[PDB]
Structure 1
Amino acid sequence: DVNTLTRFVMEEGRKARGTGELTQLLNSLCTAVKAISSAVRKAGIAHLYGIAGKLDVLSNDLVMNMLKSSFATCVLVSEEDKHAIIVEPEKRGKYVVCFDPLDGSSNIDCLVSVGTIFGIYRKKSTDEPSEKDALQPGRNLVAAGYALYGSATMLVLAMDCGVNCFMLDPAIGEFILVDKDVKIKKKGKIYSLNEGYAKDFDPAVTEYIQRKKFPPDNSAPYGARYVGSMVADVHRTLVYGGIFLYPANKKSPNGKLRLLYECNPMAYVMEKAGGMATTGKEAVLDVIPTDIHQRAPVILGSPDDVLEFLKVYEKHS
């Protein structure tokens, strides 16, 4: 049977005998993603260039507005907003959403792949909503994922039931379930990080990357890929296996990527897909944040690859 995102979420909600509030949220997000995809593909650009006589801000506006108007959210954290957004009372629901509306867009001039990342939490306390309701560890995630605006548009949705991949059919604006309950390879053959900053690498990073290019044994060296857009790199890691690194070093002891709307949703997708995601010192999903915009180093991907990195990492402890 053909299965859409709308039908999938609705069928999971009836299975779980829920009220439908999470389904209203995910439906709203899905609508926002189709609008971002349409703008990312430059629909209407002819009207900008005079046929009849910013993108990350629009994406933020689409996500913020679809989420607020879903009546399912109370606190919204965006990479684009300095403070947490508090949903007005008449629209308040029980969920906290952290999102990067258009991750990687700083390089969209080269039409590089871009994406939207989101993580959904349940509001934990009965207190008035505030920034603190978004300061939960990734362990508490209800749902997380990303939309990849790549050669095609794909939404990856991770929940307790696993990870599911929905392809956007632009002809009809429907997300078609094309990969059910996806699992990452136990071990990959690709590593992904920016080697241009090699001189600032932690010694453990230097050694682990050196083993990937010059394996001690007779196995094939890994291939290298680094798109520079986290959603693109993580998705390839999910599909092909391997390891993605943005680790800590002395000049950036906390990594560079952000915990709430980059690392945690990707770590959560990875763990639901049978992968791993660590900072080097602990699982990403176990970091308890103190700032909505705090940074986290992240090493994620195939479990065997991530375990091997941690082995090199403790060696240098």
Structure 2
Amino acid sequence: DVNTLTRFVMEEGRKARGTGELTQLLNSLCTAVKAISSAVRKAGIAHLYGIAGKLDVLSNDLVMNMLKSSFATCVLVSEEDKHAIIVEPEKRGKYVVCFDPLDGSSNIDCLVSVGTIFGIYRKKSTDEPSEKDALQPGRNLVAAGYALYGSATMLVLAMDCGVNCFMLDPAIGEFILVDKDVKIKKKGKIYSLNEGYAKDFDPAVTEYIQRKKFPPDNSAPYGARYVGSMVADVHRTLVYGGIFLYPANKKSPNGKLRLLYECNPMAYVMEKAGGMATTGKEAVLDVIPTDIHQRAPVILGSPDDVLEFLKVYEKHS
């Protein structure tokens, strides 16, 4: 039987007997994602080039506007905005949403994969809505995931029931369920980081990477892939297994990737898929944030791969 994003969400929302507010949030977000995908694929570009004689900003406005008018949100955190956005009182709801509306978009000149990443929280405090409401650890997420604008557009959604993958059929504008309750492989064959920072790598990374190229047990060396767009790298890791790394470096000593709307949502998908995400020091999901734009170092992927990296981080204290 055929399933869609909306029908999936309505069905699962009826099992748990909720008010429907998360369903409205998510419906709204799906719609924003379809409009982003449409713009990303360059629909209507002829009109820009005179046939009748900014993208990250548009995607931001799209997510924001849809999320506000879903009536389901109170605090909104975006990659694009300096401060948390506080929903006007009349449109206030119970969820806090952190998001990057178009990740990878600095590199989009070369039509690299891009995507949208989100995490949704139930507002915890009873105080007036503020920036602090977004500062919960990722263990708390109610729902998270991403859309990938690749060769095709795919929505990956993780909740309590696991991870589910919806392909956007552009002919009808519907997300179609194509991969149910997805589990990552226990062990992969591909490793992912920007090796151009090799000079700055601390010795645990350097040893770990060295083991992938020169396995110490005469197994086959891991292949390397780095699109350098977060959504594409994590998704491949999800689909094929392996390991994704963005550790700290001299230019980025607290990591480079953001915790709230990059590392947390991706960590959440990984764990729900049966995988791992770590900073090296702890799980990413357990990091208790202090600033909405703070960075985090991240290693994530197949459990045997992240474990084997943690042993090496262990070897170096």
The TM-score with structure 2 as length reference comes to 0.99
In the TM superposition, what is the alpha-carbon distance from 1:54 to its structure 2 partner? 1.2
Q: Does the aligned pair in 2 maintain the 1:277–1:300 contact within 8 Å?
A: yes
Q: Does the aligned pair in 1 maintain the 2:197–2:249 contact within 8 Å?
A: no
Q: Does the aligned pair in 2 maintain the 1:213–1:221 contact within 8 Å?
A: yes
Q: Does the aligned pair in 2 maintain the 1:246–1:297 contact within 8 Å?
A: yes
1:121 and 2:116 matched:
no
Q: Does the aligned pair in 2 maintain the 1:4–1:166 contact within 8 Å?
A: yes
- 1:132-154 deviations in Å (ceiling 9; x for gaps): 00000000000000000000000
- Structure 2 unaligned segments of length 5 or more: list them: none
Instruction: Tell me which residue corresponds to 1:311.
Output: 311
| Aligned-partner SS, 1:307 | helix
Q: Give the direction of change, closer, same or farther, for the CA distance of 1:49–1:283 in structure 2 (3 Å limit).
A: same
Q: Does the aligned pair in 1 maintain the 2:5–2:174 contact within 8 Å?
A: yes
**Aligned equivalents of 2:237 and 2:159: distance in 1?**
19
**Aligned equivalents of 2:69 and 2:56: distance in 1?**
20
In the TM superposition, what is the alpha-carbon distance from 1:253 to its structure 2 partner? 2.6
In the TM superposition, what is the alpha-carbon distance from 1:256 to its structure 2 partner? 0.4
Instruction: Tell me which residue corresponds to 1:166.
Output: 166
In the TM superposition, what is the alpha-carbon distance from 1:113 to its structure 2 partner? 0.1
Q: Does the aligned pair in 2 maintain the 1:202–1:250 contact within 8 Å?
A: no
RMSD (Å), alpha carbons: 0.6
**Aligned equivalents of 1:308 and 1:254: distance in 2?**
22
| Aligned-partner SS, 1:256 | coil
- 1:268-309 deviations in Å (ceiling 9; x for gaps): 000000000000000000000000000000100000000001
In the TM superposition, what is the alpha-carbon distance from 1:250 to its structure 2 partner? 4.9
**Aligned equivalents of 1:55 and 1:220: distance in 2?**
42
In the TM superposition, what is the alpha-carbon distance from 1:249 to its structure 2 partner? 3.4
Instruction: Tell me which residue corresponds to 1:88.
Output: 88
1:69 and 2:66 matched:
no
Instruction: Tell me which residue corresponds to 1:190.
Output: 190
| Aligned-partner SS, 2:231 | helix
**Aligned equivalents of 2:251 and 2:236: distance in 1?**
28
| Aligned-partner SS, 2:100 | strand
**Aligned equivalents of 1:271 and 1:290: distance in 2?**
23
In the TM superposition, what is the alpha-carbon distance from 1:125 to its structure 2 partner? 1.2
Q: Which has the higher mean CA deviation after the structures are superposed, 108-117 or 241-250?
A: 241-250
Instruction: Tell me which residue corresponds to 2:44.
Output: 44
| Aligned-partner SS, 2:107 | helix
- 1:227-278 deviations in Å (ceiling 9; x for gaps): 0000000000000000000012355331000000000000000000000000
Instruction: Tell me which residue corresponds to 2:143.
Output: 143
- 1:23-42 deviations in Å (ceiling 9; x for gaps): 00000000000000000000
Identity %: 100
| Aligned-partner SS, 2:106 | helix
In the TM superposition, what is the alpha-carbon distance from 1:165 to its structure 2 partner? 0.1
- 1:166-195 deviations in Å (ceiling 9; x for gaps): 000000000000000000000000000000
| Aligned-partner SS, 2:274 | coil
Q: Does the aligned pair in 1 maintain the 2:136–2:289 contact within 8 Å?
A: yes
**Aligned equivalents of 1:220 and 1:61: distance in 2?**
47
- Over 2 Å off, 4+ runs: 249-253
**Aligned equivalents of 1:195 and 1:13: distance in 2?**
43
| Aligned-partner SS, 1:261 | helix
Q: Does the aligned pair in 2 maintain the 1:164–1:181 contact within 8 Å?
A: yes
Q: Give the direction of change, closer, same or farther, for the CA distance of 1:79–1:183 in structure 2 (3 Å limit).
A: same
1:241 and 2:235 matched:
no
Q: Does the aligned pair in 2 maintain the 1:96–1:134 contact within 8 Å?
A: yes
- 1:207-245 deviations in Å (ceiling 9; x for gaps): 100000000112000000000000000000000000000
**Aligned equivalents of 1:96 and 1:236: distance in 2?**
28
**Aligned equivalents of 2:308 and 2:91: distance in 1?**
47
**Aligned equivalents of 2:125 and 2:278: distance in 1?**
28
**Aligned equivalents of 1:200 and 1:190: distance in 2?**
22
Give the length in aligned residue pairs: 317
- 1:44-70 deviations in Å (ceiling 9; x for gaps): 000000000010000000000000000
- 1:82-115 deviations in Å (ceiling 9; x for gaps): 0000000000000000000000000000000000
**Aligned equivalents of 1:251 and 1:4: distance in 2?**
43
Q: Does the aligned pair in 1 maintain the 2:72–2:92 contact within 8 Å?
A: yes
